[PDB]
Amino acid sequence: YTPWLIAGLGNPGNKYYGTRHNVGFEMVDRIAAEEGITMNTEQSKSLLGIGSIGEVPVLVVKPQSYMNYSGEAIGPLAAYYQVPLRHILLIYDDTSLPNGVLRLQKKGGLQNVIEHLDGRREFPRLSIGIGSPPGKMDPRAFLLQKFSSEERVQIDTALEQGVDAVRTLVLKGFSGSTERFNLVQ
């Protein structure tokens, strides 16, 4: 019955759609699509929507900036709706995990450096692995690439599973997510 704010990181520009570094947007779009939440409110270029997962009320947000998502979008909304920090889930692409690999973590480089810059370890977080830039590709290009066919199959799987994970977390907490999703227990 305590609400969650679920935010996915990315960029609303058209060129970013379906690219590696935008996968958190895809995830929140799936969540909202699957949970019946309409995201038709804009704050600048950020998109939001309110609905619920089961009886739990949830606000889903796609902040327009990678750099300042907290301050811009998440913080003010969470405040208004009085969402505890522990119920602000961030979802984003993680170059530190292989493509498609999901990881749900409670609160507490490059990935690591970035995380440490933005304070993301203070929230529960769903990482969607995208792997790291090969050989020595321009990181800019790498992040902008669209998944290859083989990679997309893995990412589809992750998006499918991700919805369920998030639904679980919201409905049964970390403990329920553990129970349901961890092989090793």
From Swiss-Prot:
Domain of life: Eukaryota
Site positions per UniProt: Stabilizes the basic form of H active site to accept a proton: 93
Positions of transmembrane segments: none
Localization in the cell: Plastid, Chloroplast stroma
UniProt: tRNA binding residues: 16, 66, 68
Gene Ontology terms describing biological process: mRNA processing; RNA splicing
Main location: plastid
Keywords for this protein: Chloroplast, mRNA processing, mRNA splicing, Plastid, Ribonucleoprotein, RNA-binding, Transit peptide, tRNA-binding
Family per similarity comment: Belongs to the PTH family. CRS2 subfamily.
Biological role stated in the UniProt entry: Required for the splicing of group IIB introns in chloroplasts. Forms complexes with either CAF1 or CAF2 which, in turn, interact with RNA and confer intron specificity of the splicing particles. Has no peptidyl-tRNA hydrolase activity.
Subunit record text: Interacts with CAF1 and CAF2. Part of large ribonucleo-protein complexes that include group IIB introns and either CAF1 or CAF2.
Protein name in the entry: Chloroplastic group IIB intron splicing facilitator CRS2, chloroplastic
Encoding gene (name): CRS2
